[PDB]
Amino acid sequence: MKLAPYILELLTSVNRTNGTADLLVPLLRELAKGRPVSRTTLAGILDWPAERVAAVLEQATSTEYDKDGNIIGYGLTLRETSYVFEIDDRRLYAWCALDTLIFPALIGRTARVSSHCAATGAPVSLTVSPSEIQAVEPAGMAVSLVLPQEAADVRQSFCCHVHFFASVPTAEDWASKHQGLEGLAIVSVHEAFGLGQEFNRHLLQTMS
């Protein structure tokens, strides 16, 4: 399918205020270590003052913190979701299914991703590396996408409706009982991975 509208809304969702895109990759890399991330650690990596880190995170109202005030979630999260994202010996999570396909290239690590089919509950798993996917179980795994025309922030709609499914037919049957739901589309996990690659290409071009 034509993916430009999906890429565009994802990119528009991240380039909110200066620095969000600039802080995103180092933050994802730190969260991938599986422990809460301090503002000061981020500040050191970016060579920013910590108050500037706080100012950019202040814009990202959906950022998750723990009881210590340290960062535990931004796309990749330490709090349990339906999308398990394992790096090394550390079990992390993601906010939506497409996130799990995007983050490996950004963090530069291979992840073992698992979930359950949103329509049937069947376990699904795959290995996602920066450049390819493998061990796609079951092989016909699908992903749902939405295109809220128009939300500035696609986070809420994707959290709600961007899942893994055991197959394209199962996903399309699920999608059929979402009559009227805006820009709802089903793709294979291969097509979704391609979307993420193209998103990542654009995102990374916008960094210095």
Ligand SMILES: [Br-]
């Ligand atoms: Br288009």
